[PDB]
Amino acid sequence: HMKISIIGAGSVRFALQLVGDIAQTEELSREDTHIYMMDVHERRLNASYILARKYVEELNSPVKIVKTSSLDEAIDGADFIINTAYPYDPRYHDSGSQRWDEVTKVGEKHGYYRGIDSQELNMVSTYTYVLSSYPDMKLALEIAEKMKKMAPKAYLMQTANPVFEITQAVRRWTGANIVGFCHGVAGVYEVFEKLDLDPEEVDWQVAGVNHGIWLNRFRYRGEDAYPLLDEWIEKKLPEWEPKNPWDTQMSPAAMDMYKFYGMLPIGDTVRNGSWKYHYNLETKKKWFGKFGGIDNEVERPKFHEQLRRARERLIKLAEEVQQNPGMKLTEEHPEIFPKGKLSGEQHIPFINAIANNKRVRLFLNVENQGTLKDFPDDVVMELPVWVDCCGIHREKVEPDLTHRIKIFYLWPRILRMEWNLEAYISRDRKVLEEILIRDPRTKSYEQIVQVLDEIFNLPFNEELRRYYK
Amino acid sequence: HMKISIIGAGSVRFALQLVGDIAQTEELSREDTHIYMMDVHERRLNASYILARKYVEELNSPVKIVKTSSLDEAIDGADFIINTAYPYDPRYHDSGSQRWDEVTKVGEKHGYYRGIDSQELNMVSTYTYVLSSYPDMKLALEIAEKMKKMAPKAYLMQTANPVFEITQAVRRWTGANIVGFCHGVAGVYEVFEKLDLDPEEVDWQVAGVNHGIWLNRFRYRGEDAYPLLDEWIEKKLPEWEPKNPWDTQMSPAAMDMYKFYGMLPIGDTVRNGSWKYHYNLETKKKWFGKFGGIDNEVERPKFHEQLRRARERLIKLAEEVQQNPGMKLTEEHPEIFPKGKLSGEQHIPFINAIANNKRVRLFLNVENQGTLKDFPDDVVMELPVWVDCCGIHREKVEPDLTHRIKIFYLWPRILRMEWNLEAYISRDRKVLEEILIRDPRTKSYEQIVQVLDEIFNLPFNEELRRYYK
Ligand SMILES: NC(=O)C1=CN([C@@H]2O[C@H](COP(=O)(O)OP(=O)(O)OC[C@H]3O[C@@H](n4cnc5c(N)ncnc54)[C@H](O)[C@@H]3O)[C@@H](O)[C@H]2O)C=CC1
Numbered sequence: 001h002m003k004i005s006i007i008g009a010g011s012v013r014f015a016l017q018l019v020g021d022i023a024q025t026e027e028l029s030r031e032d033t034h035i036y037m038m039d040v041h042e043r044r045l046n047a048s049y050i051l052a053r054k055y056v057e058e059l060n061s062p063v064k065i066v067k068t069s070s071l072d073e074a075i076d077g078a079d080f081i082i083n084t085a086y087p088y089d090p091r092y093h094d095s096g097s098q099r100w101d102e103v104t105k106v107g108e109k110h111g112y113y114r115g116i117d118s119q120e121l122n123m124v125s126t127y128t129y130v131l132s133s134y135p136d137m138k139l140a141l142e143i144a145e146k147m148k149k150m151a152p153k154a155y156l157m158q159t160a161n162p163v164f165e166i167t168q169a170v171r172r173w174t175g176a177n178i179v180g181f182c183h184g185v186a187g188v189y190e191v192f193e194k195l196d197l198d199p200e201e202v203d204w205q206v207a208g209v210n211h212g213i214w215l216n217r218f219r220y221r222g223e224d225a226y227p228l229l230d231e232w233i234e235k236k237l238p239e240w241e242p243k244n245p246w247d248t249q250m251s252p253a254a255m256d257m258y259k260f261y262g263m264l265p266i267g268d269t270v271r272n273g274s275w276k277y278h279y280n281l282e283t284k285k286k287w288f289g290k291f292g293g294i295d296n297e298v299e300r301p302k303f304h305e306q307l308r309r310a311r312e313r314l315i316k317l318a319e320e321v322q323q324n325p326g327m328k329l330t331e332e333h334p335e336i337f338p339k340g341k342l343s344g345e346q347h348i349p350f351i352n353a354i355a356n357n358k359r360v361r362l363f364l365n366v367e368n369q370g371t372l373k374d375f376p377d378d379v380v381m382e383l384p385v386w387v388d389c390c391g392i393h394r395e396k397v398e399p400d401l402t403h404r405i406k407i408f409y410l411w412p413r414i415l416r417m418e419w420n421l422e423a424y425i426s427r428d429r430k431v432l433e434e435i436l437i438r439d440p441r442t443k444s445y446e447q448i449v450q451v452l453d454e455i456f457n458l459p460f461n462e463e464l465r466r467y468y469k
Numbered sequence: 470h471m472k473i474s475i476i477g478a479g480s481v482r483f484a485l486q487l488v489g490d491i492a493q494t495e496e497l498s499r500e501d502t503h504i505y506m507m508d509v510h511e512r513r514l515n516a517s518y519i520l521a522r523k524y525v526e527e528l529n530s531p532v533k534i535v536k537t538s539s540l541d542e543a544i545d546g547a548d549f550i551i552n553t554a555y556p557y558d559p560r561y562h563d564s565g566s567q568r569w570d571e572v573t574k575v576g577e578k579h580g581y582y583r584g585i586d587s588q589e590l591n592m593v594s595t596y597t598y599v600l601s602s603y604p605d606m607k608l609a610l611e612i613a614e615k616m617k618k619m620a621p622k623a624y625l626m627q628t629a630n631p632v633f634e635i636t637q638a639v640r641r642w643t644g645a646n647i648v649g650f651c652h653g654v655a656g657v658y659e660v661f662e663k664l665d666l667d668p669e670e671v672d673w674q675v676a677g678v679n680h681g682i683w684l685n686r687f688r689y690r691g692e693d694a695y696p697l698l699d700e701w702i703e704k705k706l707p708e709w710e711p712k713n714p715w716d717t718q719m720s721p722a723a724m725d726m727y728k729f730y731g732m733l734p735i736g737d738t739v740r741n742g743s744w745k746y747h748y749n750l751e752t753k754k755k756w757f758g759k760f761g762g763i764d765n766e767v768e769r770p771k772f773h774e775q776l777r778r779a780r781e782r783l784i785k786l787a788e789e790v791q792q793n794p795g796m797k798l799t800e801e802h803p804e805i806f807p808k809g810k811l812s813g814e815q816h817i818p819f820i821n822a823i824a825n826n827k828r829v830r831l832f833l834n835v836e837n838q839g840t841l842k843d844f845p846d847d848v849v850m851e852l853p854v855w856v857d858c859c860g861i862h863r864e865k866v867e868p869d870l871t872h873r874i875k876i877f878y879l880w881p882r883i884l885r886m887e888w889n890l891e892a893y894i895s896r897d898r899k900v901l902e903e904i905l906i907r908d909p910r911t912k913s914y915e916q917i918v919q920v921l922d923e924i925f926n927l928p929f930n931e932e933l934r935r936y937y938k
Pocket residue numbers: 007008009010011012014038039040041044071084085086087088095096097126127139158159160161163181182183307
């Protein structure tokens with residue numbers, strides 16, 4: 001049979017997206033397709049399982065849903081393993097976002113605005129946890145080892161962050177068949193809309209690292225289309241206004257980075273700028289608009305609060321369908337349970353390409369292997385690839401990334417990845433300290449020791465503490 | 470004939486060293502050897518020329534000394550061109566150290582301790598000037614271009630700083646036959662003395678970048694000798710005491726870097742540490758001893774004052790020999806005019822190897838060419854090489870540099886070199902700003918603009934200002 005296992009399936013809205021796409025995919029919506037939903041939180045797991053089955057029935061799909069609390073059962077014989085899990089210490093927390101928010105406050109308590117995990121070219125909230133991302137790296141490596149023995153032919157589709165660090169560590173240290181997934185490339189489509197360009201007429205390409213990708217090719221009617229962006233910057237940027245904290249693709253920060261690097265940063269890359277745009281909230285609002293972006297002391301906690309409420313609402317919704325089995329989820333909540341239209345994420349298209357040879361162009365985190373010849377072959381890059389039955393095939397990156405992107409952006413970010421991996425495998429707190437010694441916000445060595453001490457001493461970091469002892 | 474040209478021969482004590490070594494080298498001390506002394510300062514040039522000829526006569530050497538104020542005359546048909554020049558604006562200064570000290574004060578005025586040119590892994594005073602080192606890079610490139618046309622077979626022996634940036638820029642942008650020289654490797658000999666080891670019994674090697682070299686091999690009696698350093702750190706480091714501001718090879722800073730990186734930094738590399746050891750003068754004194762090293766607000770200006778006095782003393786000494794031609798410079802000032810013993814620098818041994826096939830092991834700045842396979846072939850490294858009649862031959866670097874040296878030290882330093890070269894060739898002040906945006910001491914973007922504005926506005930930076938306009 002076709003076994004697709006979702007690790008961390010309590011991520012309900014994302015689980016239902018995966019389920020909905022599988023049910024609305026002709027080649028996968030079969031009785032021979034088994035979706036395994038696995039999670040450590042019983043309440044969330046059950047809620048997801050109930051909503052998933054009710055959702056599948058309304059879509060009239062014969063795929064069978066199986067829930068399990070055993071990671072081994074989900075991994076055993078799986079064809080594809082989707083890791084969207086966000087570990088947490090259940091003695092003190094209910095989800096993973098809590099540990100990152102709390103340590104971030106300890107960081108700011110010691111003079112590190114937005115926490116020590118916020119660094120130059122690395123501002124995306126909740127991306128790394130205490131630099132080395134111990135609980136997240138640990139789980140990914142555990143799955144990889146269990147996978148090599150129990151599912152030798154499976155693909156580990158890593159979505160939990162940090163995608164870059166994790167995918168690199170698993171590939172380098174286990175040789176497991178892992179691929180990192182993120183749809184940050186989707187930002188290009190707002191560029192085309194703002195410039196009044198039919199996407200189908202645009203010959204474009206992006207490449208870089210996760211949350212560090214650049215519009216290296218942007219052409220229209222047989223010519224470079226960047227002069228059209230120059231015109232927009234001069235005639236329409238002064239009136240740009242963000243629709244919500246997440247709206248940053250066409251922000252002053254994005255264009256200032258374009259002016260310097262020569263290519264437009266795409267997606268979360270705009271969030272991952274130098275400290276020039278992130279010294280404080282006032283600075284963020286100058287460069288990202290009224291909200292100050294999403295990675296600040298106001299919007300980040302607010303967004304995480306919305307997520308918690310959304311979890312409970314969906315839990316209670318699962319109790320509603322059990323009491324009222326006659327309701328139609330697709331009718332009363334069409335947004336959360338779409339019908340007909342696919343989500344647009346890359347996970348299921350990827351599965352449909354490997355399993356059913358439905359060839360598709362995707363943007364995935366895979367080893368360089370000479371694609372960006374100036375970087376090592378084994379470094380995991382976010383590259384344009386065509387996926388089919390027999391492997392993943394990297395496109396040629398043309399034009400190549402600019403000289404400034406390589407020396408001022410890609411390499412510093414690649415080195416930070418290496419710093420973080422070294423901090424994990426070495427189990428040496430001195431590596432963590434060295435990373436903060438390169439941090440602009442550090443004023444003294446004694447400051448570094450103190451912020452790390454308080455972080456390590458938090459009750460829910462007992463495991464992390466013993467790891468580095 | 471054999472034409473050896475010294476560009477910047479007003480560097481008298483270094484010029485006399487070069488002359489003394491040539492006169493005391495059997496194969497070079499010939500009537501067919503012409504030493505051309507060239508400099509833009511008439512007083513210093515003449516003083517050096519007079520002291521040089523009197524010195525040669527007392528050594529009973531037939532080499533002829535020629536002084537000239539024409540760079541073209543010195544370069545024309547030269548076999549070896551030694552660039553020890555330190556440019557300066559004569560309308561406001563008398564030597565090059567003045568412009569660096571003054572801009573350093575402007576930097577500290579704006580909150581950049583020890584000036585913007587002091588950066589992590591780059592604390593050596595007077596190494597770079599306003600990041601891009603415009604006057605020094607400009608002169609080196611001028612010589613290289615004049616050299617390709619007027620002396621196609623000559624070697625440009627670069628000694629003026631920044632050696633790394635300059636040698637890289639000349640090689641990459643002109644293909645001139647440049648080699649960078651620095652004798653920082655000599656620090657290893659103090660290690661052996663402190664550990665009671667006969668140098669001739671030590672199988673050792675160093676490699677890295679200029680002022681960024683590491684004792685990668687340290688063996689004694691067929692075993693790794695680093696356990697002998699571990700013993701010294703435990704039993705003799707607590708009583709270590711610097712003899713002078715320059716004494717740092719066995720300092721707490723050097724050993725702390727050894728503990729983290731796994732190999733001992735050698736020479737100026739100990740000065741080029743992270744900000745952990747250089748936040749302020751008190752911190753420097755904790756890690757370097759009572760003097761706080763040499764790169765601080767007390768010792769650096771004091772050392773530069775000693776140099777100025779030494780220049781005048783030697784100028785007046787040149788007036789003495791003209792009035793008293795009977796005096797013996799080798800007798801009344803044996804230190805400044807040695808006799809019998811060679812200096813130990815690598816410049817003349819290098820010349821004697823290329824010209825007379827006197828094969829010797831040296832440590833020179835040359836393109837990697839696979840020696841450190843993890844780095845690009847064209848990056849200029851400071852490597853162990855054997856020089857003879859027909860080329861420079863790189864030794865195998867074994868053991869390889871540790872993983873931490875590469876990701877935490879060598880690569881960040883190599884990237885800074887690329888930042889500085891980009892800042893020079895682009896003529897784009899935004900590149901300078903980006904470098905300071907990665908500076909830990911920066912608190913705001915407006916601070917960056919202001920410190921650069923005041924630096925660019927200094928009268929003796931008119932040329933630099935027009936360059937970046
Ligand atoms: N790659 C991408 O496109 C993006 C990355 N993410 C990442 O995806 C992850 C999940 O994000 P959210 O859904 O918002 O958080 P969430 O808390 O709603 O989902 C995490 C789920 O994983 C469960 N789980 C925790 N530990 C587990 C373990 N050992 N084994 C199995 N299941 C476990 C948790 O109980 C929870 O139900 C996060 O790490 C987040 O950073 C989120 C958005 C974009």
